[PDB]
RNA sequence: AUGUGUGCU
């Protein structure tokens, strides 16, 4: 027959999509490829590497700044930016602040067509005489790439940062059983998606389906 | 038995429950009440966790 | 091989010879002594328990058989071997909860 | 008459007919109400042989009071269904739980799938 | 816990953080190795979000049994992605995230008793 | 699990009290028309084919979901034996 | 294996992953070539298997092989009961028939 | 960086397909979902019911016939009967012969737009005076259809046969690598398909692709 | 309707 697609969205991050009824087996058949696509294909961005002034190693501690360097570096990974035009491929955010102020992700001086979809993300609390002058790289990767795989040495002694590109935080799916009067062994696809807010779940799903279709068009010109 | 009858049959239970009885009934937890799910096949399907209760393999 | 024969499951040959007529109801045997003794091949005889006993031929017309060699299979034999089931490619592993 | 569509012989059902739980196997009456022999709630199947021991019986016993007996061999072929009992020679009993289709079954790098999956926790 | 590989200390060596780490990248000591106090899997891989650690697992970089560093409710935790996944399971099972991390135990594997 | 049973068990002195309450509630809810319910406008039990649980699929489900709100009160003796039976059949079809 | 290595196919990425995990497991010997690792595994009755409903190889080699399994005399159709209300008896009102 | 598609169709029973390159693990993301549809769906052709000359029930025998009725019919399942046009929905093949000869499947009376790809198939050995006069009805369906379901009564004593519709017999995929000297981690998909002949592996592959595509379209309108 | 026997749990 024809399966209906029902959405239960909760804002901009979480959505639960249910497509039913499905022919036997097609539940995982459809649900599983998308899950792979979602966690590794959707184009987002991330912090690839960061340079700080009085910081040499990744495992250092800067007095005046309470939070250890690694802790800050985590929070750098926790932010999500968005590029207005496709032209922007690699952009560098600049940051500078001193004293008993704290730095949030909105303090990064806005560079051209760069939007910060998450401003109040705590970057670092600073004490008296706490000087902090850092800079951050932003590339347009696709998925997750450990720091010790790229480590973009933008400056001379910058620090590699694990690049968490994939907009989806996580994607989980299940195939329950549904009936159609005659038969009860009909697959029921329930697919839940968790994002960082860069893109709503439905948009991401749209992305997945498109990506799969374009791939299905590759089996057309034999040689 | 057409679709109508089956759909009706789902409308006749909903919250209703049935009692499932073990071969040798020993202790209190030897008979439980479960909500019936219209499953194909011909054997009674029983939940994993309630086995060791009335000792069923 | 011993079980099927000793249990009188299948039918064997009594004396050397060639094959006359392989039907699904009979197997006629060419004894050298100018004799062909009639063999029934019984298809659907209800067991005392409920199962079905079938004797099916295992030699083709125009073949020389020997004394004590099989001509048909029993309800649970395959070419003379006790056939009590199936040989299935099994993977031993836990699978969901099934 | 629709229930008699299989009744071929004058009293005996045809051989090779399909009988189902409630189908009429034998036709006979007593003191006139129907007291015939129908197929039990279980299952019939396909008739293979119909034995009938009459009164003019060339040397039989036959139960006292009874004039004639009508026995029907209803055969049927049963496939392996969820719930059947399977075991080996080493001694692992086990009822069939699910019959997964070929596609969602653990398979080798070769195109060849597995037939049966046996829990290691039973060992 | 695998072969010690090369050198087993970091109970205090100030250099051992930036140094021994590179060792694993060389060939010296494997990932979840009892390299004392920590292990390269804890230094190399620090995951910001508790969720993100599990996202990394789906990219075959760290197994659900490799000891790494995560951050549940805002603090550094020495544990494996699988364990934090167990924590998350119990959490979202009963909707109460607070007691979920309190009721379980994240220092030993899960058995009948646990 | 069931509609918030922990609230229900705590709601009464003995666990059996709840059972009798629910049962009798279902009974009168079925015998005197399913209209004498105490939560029929928007906050009400529904089903899956149509939303037609609004009428009469299950009796107990209703009783349990009703008791969940302070709309009903149980107890030993509250109303005379016959009078209750009479007026409960009068006020409704 | 000779069939594959000969036909024009080699060590699948999935096989390689499973081997990598098998090293940590303790079955295969650290050092050999993926082919020899697979040999060591095959010797132990174990072989790389794919989930089938995903494609993801089951992380950890499992012993596979054909065994002899027999369908016992019990069935389910031989034992199936489901009556709500039917015949009773003239001598005893307890339901059976 | 555009995926190349190579075909290696050896005959009509076997078929091999190559796709290279794919970005990251996208081989498995395509390999499995197709294998599922290739084994599950796809229109096939099998024998539905058969009527023998004097045979009434499935549990019989025939004078001059080594194989009992069940065994004979059991062979008809291993038969492949390739049609030509979609119009052919119910082709009732006929077969009758006598004399000492192995009745191969190449003896069926030929029909207008129908071909038997499986000629050598053993039906029954005929004995001195053995003679069989049978009508083998062939239908077109999909997937596994147990005979105890349809029960197609062609004649009157016709005995229904398990319909096993699935031209695709076996499928397996392999994921290699190489190509593009820049990024190392890449995928190379190689999908091997074995079909019974009624449908060439290429045709099956294309059909499966169409199926998957149609299923992808379903995620359109939410509710 | 009771006994004998076997099968499984
Ligand atoms: Mg038991």
Closest nt by CA–C1' to G92:
I1
Nearest to E17 by CA among E35, E2, E3: E35
Closest CA to I6 C1' — which residue?
Answer: C49
Q: What is the CATH number of the domain that holds F2?
A: 3.90.940.10
Residues of A at the B interface, defined by Cβ within 8 angstroms: 179-185
Residue G54 near residue A32 (C-beta atoms within 8 A) = yes
Contact in structure between H93 and H136 (CB atoms under 8 Å) = yes
Using CB atoms, pick whichever of D75, D114, D121 lies closest to residue C91.
D114
Locate tokens 């004399």: which residue? H99
Give C50 CA → I4 C1' in Å. 22
CB contacts under 8 A, D 59-118 vs B, are 81-83, 95
How many angstroms is C1' of I4 away from CA of D27? 35
d(CA E71, C1' I5) / Å: 70
* Alpha-carbon torsion, ordered H7, H10, H14, H18, to 10 deg: -20
Q: Compute the nearest-CA separation of G25 from chain E (Å).
A: 10
CA H93 to chain centre: 17
Query: Closest CA to I8 C1' — which residue?
Result: G74
- Residue where the block lists tokens 């039913």: A20
Gap between the Cα atoms of H192 and H199, Å rounded: 14
Resolution in A: 3.5
* DSSP one-letter string for A56-103: -SSS---TTB-S-HHHHHHHHHH--EEESSTT-SEEEEEEEEESS-EE
**What is the Cα–Cα distance from A172 to A31, expressed in whole angstroms?**
9
E77, E42 Cβ separation under 8 angstroms: no
Identify how the structure was determined. Answer: X-ray
* Number of domains present in the structure of chain F: 1
DSSP strand E in chain A: where?
Answer: 4-10, 14-22, 46-51, 81-83, 90-98, 102-104, 114-116, 122-125, 131-139, 144-145, 159-160, 163-164, 168-178, 186-195
For ligand 1, a single-atom ion, the residues with CB < 5 A are B 57
C touches D (3+ CB pairs < 8 Å)?
yes
Is C90 close to D116, i.e. CB distance below 8 A? yes
Check if C46 contacts D (Cβ < 8 Å). Answer: yes
What φ, ψ does residue A116 adopt, rounded to 5°? -105, 100
Pick from A95, G64, E55: nearest CA to C91: G64
CA E70 to chain centre: 7
Estimate in Å the CA D34 to C1' I1 gap, whole number. Answer: 25
Domain A1-43+166-219 class, CATH top level: alpha beta
- Which residues in chain A touch residue B6, judged by CB atoms under 8 angstroms apart? 179, 181-182
Instruction: Please give, one letter per residue, the 3-state secondary structure of chain B.
Output: CCHHHHHHHHHCCCCCCEEEECCCCCCHHHEEEECCCCCCCCCCCCCCCCCCCCCCC
Interface test with G, best of A26, A28, A189 (most G CBs within 10 A): A28
The domain of F86 spans 1-93
> Which residue carries 């009428």 as its tokens?
F55
Structure tokens at B1: 């038995």
CATH ID of A44-165, from 3.50.50.60, 1.10.10.10, 2.170.120.12, 3.20.10.10: 2.170.120.12
Query: Which of C24, C53, C62 is best to mutate for the H interface (most H CBs within 10 A)?
Result: C24
Q: Which residues contact E80 (CB under 8 A, 6 or more apart)?
A: E64, E65, E66, E67, E68
Could you tell me if D102 lies within 8 Å of chain A, comparing CB atoms? no
Residues of A in contact with D101 (CB under 8 A): 24-25
On whether any CB of chain D is under 8 Å from the CB of H58, the answer is: yes
In chain C, residues with a C-beta closer than 8 Å to the C-beta of H64 are: 23
Picking from D59, D119, D69, the residue whose alpha carbon sits closest to that of residue D95 is D119
Residue D83 CA to nucleotide I7 C1', Å?
18
Q: How far apart (Å, rounded) are the C-alpha atoms in residues C94 and D119? A: 5
Identify all chain H residues contacting G14, using CB atoms and an 8 Å cutoff. Answer: 28, 175
Cα(A134)–Cα(A110) distance, integer angstroms: 14
Whether residue H172 and residue D102 make contact (CB cut-off 8 A), yes or no, is: no
Domain extent for D65: 1-77
The distance (Å) linking the CA of G91 with the C1' of I3 is 21
Q: Is D95 in Cβ contact with B41 (below 8 Å)?
A: no
Among candidates H5, H36, H218 on the partner chain, residue whose Cβ is nearest the Cβ of A19? H218
Q: How far apart are CA A148 and CA A48, in angstroms?
A: 11
Residue extents of the structural domains in chain H: 1-43+166-219, 44-165
Tally C-beta pairs within 8 A across C and D.
42
> In Å, how far is A32's CA from the nearest CA of chain D?
12
Q: Which of E5, E30, E62, E63 to mutate to test the interface with G (most CBs of G within 10 A)?
A: E63
Q: Which helix (H) or strand (E) holds H43?
A: strand H43-51
Dihedral in degrees, nearest 10, Cα atoms H97, H101, H102, H105: -40
Query: What is the distance between the alpha carbons of residues F42 and F58, in angstroms, rounded to a whole number?
Result: 18
CB atoms within 10 A of CB C30: 17
Q: In the complex, which subunits touch C with 3 or more CB pairs below 8 angstroms?
A: D, G, H
CA/C1' separation G74–I8 (Å): 8
Q: Is B57 annotated as a binding residue?
A: yes
Smallest CA-to-CA distance from F24 within F80, F87, F57, F66 is with F66
Question: For domain C9-83, which architecture applies?
Answer: Beta Barrel (2.40)
CA-closest candidate to residue G13, choices H178, H174, A33: H174
Which candidate from A180, A182, A184 shows the least CB-CB separation from B39?
Answer: A184
Is H15:H205 a contact under the CB 8 Å cutoff? yes
In chain C, which residue ranges form alpha helices assigned H by DSSP? 2-6
The DSSP element (H or E) to which A147 belongs, if any, is helix A147-150
Give the nearest nucleotide to B23, CA to C1'. I9
Question: Could you tell me how many CB contacts below 8 A there are between chain A and chain E?
Answer: 51
Q: How far is CA B37 from the centre of its chain?
A: 7
Distance in angstroms (rounded) separating the CA atoms of residues G69 and G37: 31
C-alpha of residue A59 to centroid of ligand 1, in Å? 59
Cβ–Cβ gap H32/G55 under 8 Å: yes
Measured CA to CA, the distance from residue A120 to residue A211 in angstroms comes to 33
- Count how many pairs of residues, chain E against chain G, have C-beta atoms within 8 Å: 3
Collapsing DSSP states into helix, strand and coil, what is residue D118?
Answer: coil
Q: How far is the CA of B56 from the centre of ligand 1 (A)?
A: 6
Rounded to whole angstroms, the distance from the CA of residue D7 to the C1' of nucleotide I1 is 35
B57 C-alpha vs ligand 1 centroid, how far in Å? 5
Q: Do D121 and C94 touch (CB under 8 A)?
A: yes
Instruction: Assign residue D9 the CATH number of its domain.
Output: 2.40.50.150
Nearest to H16 by CA among G13, D102, G8, D114: G8
**CA neighbours closer than 13 Å in the CB half-sphere of residue G63:** 9
Residue H95 is classified by DSSP as: E
Q: Which residues of D touch B41 (CB under 8 A)?
A: 81-83
DSSP for chain E, please give it: -----S----SS-TTHHHHHHHHHHHTSS-TT---SS--HHHHS-B-SSHHHHHHHHTTTSS-TTS-EEEEETTEEEEE-HHHHHHHHHHHHHHS-HHHHHHHS-SSS---S--
Nearest to E51 by CA among E21, E102, E92, E110: E92
Backbone phi, psi, residue H93, to 5°: -65, 155
Nucleotides of I under 7 A from a protein CB: 1, 7-9
CB-nearest to D111 from H56, H144, H194 is H194
Helices A26-38 and H201-217 pack at an angle, to 10 degrees, of: 70
Q: Which of B23, B40, B43, B47 should one mutate to test binding to chain D, selecting the residue with the greatest count of D CBs within 10 A?
A: B43
Distances (CA, A) of F62 to A195, F57, F79: 39, 10, 22
In the reported structure, the alpha carbon of residue D84 is separated from the centroid of ligand 1 by a whole-number distance in angstroms of 14
Closest Cβ–Cβ partner in D16, D103, D109 for H157: D16
Find chain E residues with C-beta within 8 A of A59's C-beta.
17-18, 43
Residue D78 is encoded by which pair of tokens?
């049963």
Chain D residues within 8 A of G70 when measuring between CB atoms: 86-89
SS3 call for A207: helix
Report the 10 Å Cβ neighbour count for C25. Answer: 18
Q: What is the CA(E112)–ligand 1 centre distance, in A?
A: 22
Residue A188 Cα distances to A5, B50, H5, angstroms: 11, 26, 34
């Amino acid at each position: 027959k024809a399966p209906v697609f029902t959405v239960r969205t909760q804002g901009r991050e979480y959505g639960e999509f249910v497509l039913e009824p499905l022919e036997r087996g097609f539940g995982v058949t459809l649900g599983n490829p998308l899950r792979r696509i979602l966690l590794s294909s959707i184009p987002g961005t991330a912090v690839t590497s960061v340079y700080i002034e009085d910081v040499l190693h990744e495992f250092s501690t800067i007095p005046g700044v309470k939070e250890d360097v690694v802790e800050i570096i985590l929070n750098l990974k926790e932010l999500v930016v968005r590029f207005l035009n496709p032209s922007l491929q690699t952009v560098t955010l600049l940051l500078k602040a001193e004293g008993p102020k704290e730095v949030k992700a909105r303090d990064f001086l806005p560079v051209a067509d760069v939007e910060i979809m998450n401003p109040d993300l705590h970057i670092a609390t600073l004490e008296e005489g706490g000087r902090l002058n850092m800079e951050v790289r932003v590339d347009r990767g696709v998925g997750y790439v450990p720091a010790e795989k790229h480590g973009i040495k933008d400056r001379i002694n910058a620090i590699p940062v694990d690049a968490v590109f994939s907009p989806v935080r996580r994607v989980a799916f299940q195939v329950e059983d549904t009936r159609l009067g005659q038969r009860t062994d009909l697959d029921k696809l329930t697919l839940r998606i968790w994002t960082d807010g860069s893109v709503t779940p439905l948009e991401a799903l749209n992305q997945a389906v498109e990506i799969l279709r374009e791939h299905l068009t590759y089996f057309s010109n034999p040689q | 038995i057409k679709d109508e009858v089956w759909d009706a049959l789902e409308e006749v239970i909903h919250g209703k429950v049935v009692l499932l009885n073990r071969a040798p009934t020993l202790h209190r937890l030897g008979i439980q009440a479960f909500q019936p799910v219209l499953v194909e096949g011909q054997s009674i399907q029983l939940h994993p966790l309630v086995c060791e209760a009335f000792n069923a393999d | 091989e011993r079980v099927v024969r000793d249990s009188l499951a299948a039918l064997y040959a009594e004396e050397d010879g060639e094959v006359a007529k392989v039907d699904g109801n009979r197997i006629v045997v060419r004894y050298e002594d100018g004799r062909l003794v009639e063999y029934p091949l019984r298809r659907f005889y209800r067991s005392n328990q409920g199962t079905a006993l079938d004797q099916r031929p295992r030699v083709v017309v125009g073949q020389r058989v020997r004394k004590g060699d099989l001509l048909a299979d029993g309800p649970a034999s395959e070419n003379g071997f006790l056939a009590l089931g199936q040989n299935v490619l099994v993977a031993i592993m836990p699978f969901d909860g099934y | 008459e629709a229930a008699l569509r299989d009744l071929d012989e004058e009293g005996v059902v045809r051989i090779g007919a399909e009988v189902k739980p409630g189908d009429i196997l034998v036709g006979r009456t007593s003191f006139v109400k129907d007291t015939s022999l129908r197929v039990p709630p279980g299952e019939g199947g396909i008739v293979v042989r119909t034995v009938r021991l009459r009164r003019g019986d060339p040397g039989v016993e036959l139960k006292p009071g009874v004039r004639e007996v009508v026995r029907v061999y209803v055969a049927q072929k049963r496939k392996l269904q969820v719930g059947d009992k399977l075991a080996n020679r080493h001694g692992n009993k086990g009822v069939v739980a699910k019959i997964l289709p070929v596609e969602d079954m653990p398979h080798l790098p070769d195109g060849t799938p597995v037939d049966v999956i046996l829990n290691p926790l039973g060992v | 816990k695998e072969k010690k590989g090369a050198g087993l200390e970091f109970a205090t060596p100030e250099e051992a953080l930036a140094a021994h780490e590179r060792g694993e990248v060389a060939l010296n000591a494997p990932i979840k190795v009892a390299g004392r106090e920590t292990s390269v899997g804890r230094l190399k891989y620090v995951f910001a979000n508790p969720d993100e650690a599990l996202l990394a697992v789906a990219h075959g970089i760290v197994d659900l049994q490799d000891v790494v560093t995560v951050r549940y409710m805002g603090k550094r935790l020495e544990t494996s992605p699988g364990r934090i996944l167990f924590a998350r399971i119990v959490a979202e099972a009963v909707e109460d995230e607070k007691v979920a991390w309190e009721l379980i135990q994240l220092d030993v594997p899960q058995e009948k008793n646990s | 699990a069931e509609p918030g049973i922990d609230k229900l068990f705590g709601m009464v002195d003995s666990k059996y009290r709840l059972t009798v309450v629910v049962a009798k509630r279902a009974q009168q809810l079925l015998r005197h028309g399913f209209k004498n319910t105490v939560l029929e406008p928007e906050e009400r039990p529904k089903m899956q084919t149509l939303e037609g649980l609004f009428d009469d699929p299950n009796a107990v489900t209703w009783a349990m979901k009703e008791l969940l709100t302070g709309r009903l009160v149980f107890g030993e003796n509250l109303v005379p034996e016959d009078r209750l039976q009479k007026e409960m059949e009068r006020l409704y079809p | 294996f000779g069939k594959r290595k000969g036909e024009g196919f080699g060590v699948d990425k999935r096989e390689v992953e499973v081997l990598r995990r098998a090293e940590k497991l303790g079955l295969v010997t650290p050092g050999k070539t993926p082919e020899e690792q697979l040999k060591e595994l095959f010797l132990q009755g174990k072989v790389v298997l794919y989930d089938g409903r995903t494609g993801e190889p089951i992380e950890g080699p499992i012993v596979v092989g054909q065994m002899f399994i027999m369908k016992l005399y019990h069935m389910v159709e031989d034992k199936m009961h489901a009556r709500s209300t039917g015949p009773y008896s003239l001598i005893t009102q307890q339901p059976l028939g």
